[PDB]
Amino acid sequence: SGKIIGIDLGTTNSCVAIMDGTTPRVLENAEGDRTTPSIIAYTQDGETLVGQPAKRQAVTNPQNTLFAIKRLIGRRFQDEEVQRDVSIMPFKIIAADNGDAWVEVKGQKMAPPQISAEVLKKMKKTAEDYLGEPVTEAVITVPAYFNDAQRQATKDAGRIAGLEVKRIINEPTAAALAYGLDKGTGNRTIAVYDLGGGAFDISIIEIDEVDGEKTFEVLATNGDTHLGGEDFDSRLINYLVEEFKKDQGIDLRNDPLAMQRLKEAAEKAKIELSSAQQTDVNLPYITADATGPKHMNIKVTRAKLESLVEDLVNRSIEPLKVALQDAGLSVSDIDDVILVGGQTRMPMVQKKVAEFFGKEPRKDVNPDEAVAIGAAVQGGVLTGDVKDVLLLDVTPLSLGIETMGGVMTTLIAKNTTIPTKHSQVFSMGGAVTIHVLQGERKRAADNKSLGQFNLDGINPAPRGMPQIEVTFDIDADGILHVSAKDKNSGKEQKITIKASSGLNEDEIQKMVRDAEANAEADRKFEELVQTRNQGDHLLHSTRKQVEEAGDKLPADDKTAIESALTALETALKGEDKAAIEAKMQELAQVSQKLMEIAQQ
């Protein structure tokens, strides 16, 4: 029911679009911006900020501002990437009871999907404000290289936000839909290079004209879900931290508040160096010492920045080589190179990509909105409003199991088109345990574990010939479903999953309720502010009343009203809602009493 909205849920920024009749349209949020910082904050006084308002106060609220949660979602606390972030992120990152990576604010433990849900709720509200009706369904994007846990956790975030997730769409695929919508873009093969704030994808995609309809087929995909702008900032921040040690004899890394100003300054500097060739990091009173206040002043050149991050850029080139090999194509087979994501605005990135492909990337693709637009198009395909568009995506990782000798044994090869299914008999009746993993490495230890899937035996029976067949389905969302039956009886077998990541149904249901309670509490937090407005309106009117009365007003009456006004003004400066309300009531009674005496 209603419109299926398209939400690009980004590490750094989020963006929502719809089908406006036959044309996709990106929607401005309440603040008037076409994108929304993927940031949530909890203030000391207990307010929940989302988006720009949360971004604005981040510098002074290190611990209770959550950002880049997309780098934690669907991960385990003991993951190398997470363990590194633990020491780096200013907010607190902890292990959930099941070992998943969670955060903690003011003593409260929260799962990443709960945090992303807040961002999704704002995007949902954005669409509803625009449309003038409720929105309950969405297509939500994920990086192409997201694994099973990361996909499912993103899907759970959508549910926690009150959205039925009709499709999880791979971000480069979404960008391709956006690009190929324009008639005259048929019968070509493109490379979509997407380098954002947190993730990197490369997809090779063919757009063809079959039976008078446009088909988008992903030939190969690769990337790195933990490579993006955040890592570029970090290289520059560490340089600035090391320089200030040498220069002013002080280590800033021990100090959260200084690091906030620096983080902010480094990102601005990085961004400036995409157009200028020099930038100044000026942080007066960055810190202090025995000798007094300290100030940071350091010029950074483009050349300096480049030497700091070139290996990150090279890291994005290697998956390109693998993607072309997997697709069986050379660079000359690629008709268009498409750059997506804010971090691709770096000249070095554009230059290295141009040089690899031996051609310049297109300039007519919006690096900030293409993904959301494609998510909207995908939604329109689902509702049937978008005709003559067919899409065939793949799974980015090999699905396998740990077999005898601790080896990784592949069941479904990477770049297999989805949905897809693989069935296999695992037992003639004895119990079965299956350790499922994703990845390309030879040893199970080197791949991403999805969990242990356990089946009980089937007891011996006259004329029974148990054949326990296990089926691995990958659906259109790129998500795995494992089921089993006895082929001999047709009876389904219960599978018990152990050591898997993710939320269970009970947690999800509780978190859905928590999000509704949060909404209520937010509506409850606003009362103080709403009462101030009313207070200001009242002040304005009763002042006019006093002016009108002029000298006709007796001193005792003039004094009583002027005291009531001042009292309300004072209360308004404060934070006590009850006091404001009482002073408003007293002022109203004096305004009414004056009125009544004037009529006499």
Next chain:
Amino acid sequence: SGKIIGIDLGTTNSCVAIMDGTTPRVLENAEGDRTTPSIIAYTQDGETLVGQPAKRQAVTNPQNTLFAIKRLIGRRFQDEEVQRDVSIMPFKIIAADNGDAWVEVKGQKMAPPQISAEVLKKMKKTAEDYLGEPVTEAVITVPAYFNDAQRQATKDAGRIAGLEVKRIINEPTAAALAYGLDKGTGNRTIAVYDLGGGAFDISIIEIDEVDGEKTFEVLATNGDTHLGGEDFDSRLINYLVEEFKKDQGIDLRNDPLAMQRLKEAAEKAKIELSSAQQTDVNLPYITADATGPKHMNIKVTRAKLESLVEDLVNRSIEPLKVALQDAGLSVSDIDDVILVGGQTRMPMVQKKVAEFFGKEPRKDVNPDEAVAIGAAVQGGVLTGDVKDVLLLDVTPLSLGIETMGGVMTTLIAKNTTIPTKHSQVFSMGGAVTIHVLQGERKRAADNKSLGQFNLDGINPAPRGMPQIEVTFDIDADGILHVSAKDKNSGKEQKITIKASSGLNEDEIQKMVRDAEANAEADRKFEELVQTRNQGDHLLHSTRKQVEEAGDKLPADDKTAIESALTALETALKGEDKAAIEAKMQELAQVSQKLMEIAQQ
């Protein structure tokens, strides 16, 4: 030759678009932004900054940062509107020799068109970078209510930027083109309400279908060229100044740095109050008393803000009434209300407009880019690329002359469609002086003077029957051209214009050369930056050369090379190009030498 680019030259922000084949496209500037702040700055070391870099340093350089120049362009120094601004603007506004309003920076007097040209040059360069080739032609926008002087001055700015201005297009007309391009927006009548940073326009526009082609006809236009966001900010700034005065007993108005910080904070507060119901203005260390530093902290509710500016909003409603009357329509006849301009994002503004028209404004119009898009479309109509699009605009002000009694006599009524022509015999041979004015007021003294147009007599001659006919042409740009001729002989009569506003050919030519000199100076300034980058590259490589040598390096050689490294690092900390280049040279020679010795 080349593309005719469309440039929205705004009081606050500027935006450039082109026809990308058959589709209009807004172009990002070098900073990656789809719009550019109309801000020009001159730094202490003599650099000229435009756009975001100028905006960024305004807080510390308020005297030599020029902004809102569109509020001075085409105006006289003694104009009431300018005189008010003289006391408000942080930079120095002065009278030119002819009385026009100019600005002075560091002893240099400059004409508004020279300043705006710097913004147009950036927009021009933006298009050139995208297209990969030179751009010499443009369509440039002006408020529909701009008078003759304002139009010509804007056209002069285009020339000074090296642009042949093919069309001056009224901004609401541009927005209508953008809106009506969408097939299926035909046969309707729209009201375009445009409230920006400096100017207000209302235009009533009919979009029809004649002989297969779409025609856009402006039925009426009105507005106020000195009413916009800057005035909203100003109301809030004065409130904040007064509150701090009552609170801390300090008057900030004489503190340029404090006032610049306040200006910025005030606009941010105004903008938040478009989506939130309360905002906090915080300015630590805003001033210092003998008691110590003082900090500004005050909460502002939407209710407070609305009471500070409601009369500004109401001032925009009265021209709506006049426009409908001039169009001969009622609100009922309006099919679509279109809001353009950032200042229309204010809830009070939208509500007042919705209430006036009795319908909700459309939501599917881009308030920041519609005007640039329309300018690009107009450009494509000029090149013959855009087909079946005809536009018919009007002149917004009555054109008249001062007749006996000091009365205003109308020659061309407001809302007459342009281009248009009016011819009249003024003399049977005697010398003639014609005082030309624009406006609707009955007394000449109350209208805008365009100058005195003088004609010499024609001497008595046998068979001569001199009939001096003066022709008033208003061209497609909405600009006046007065010519005269003797109908009896056909000979053209020379007109001498006195007491008029604007730049003469000689000034324009000199200003064109000055701008080219500024570009050259800019390339010069870049030299230092380029040298710094090369320095960083050189440091990087030679450091690797030292490491690779390790212990093999003799103590005297290691000392020498490390001295040279340090000396370059030191020079790069300074601002002396010569020293940097010398230290680069010495480091290079030492590197080369050790290399040679290592080869031995």
